Amino acid sequence: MKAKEIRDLTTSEIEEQIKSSKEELFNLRFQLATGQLEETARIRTVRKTIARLKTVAREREIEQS
Template sequence: MKTADVRQFSDEELQSELERLRRHLFDLRSQSVTEKLEDSSMLKKTRRDIARLLTVQRERELAASRPQGR
């Protein structure tokens, strides 16, 4: 998932995707503990996707709170 793609999401889509990825990360961690995880790089990729979503969400919060005069 690229940051440019994430920026096109609406706020609701952003939140639902964030929840979906967090559930997916939980499932991946469970698979890792039980040694059923086939691709361990998915943990890192999912964490980074979550970070991208949170970054875009925070950018929007800061842009909304910034005065419009400047």
């Protein structure tokens, strides 16, 4: 998810997405550990989305302050 889409999401929506993304990443890590994951690129894609989600959240908090 690109920053623009994240920016549309409400603060709560971002927080929910952060939780959802982290669970997905965890699942991928366990799948890779068990050798069940072929689409390894997904892991990184999820990671960068979480980073983006956190960035937008931080930007909002700084704007508030």
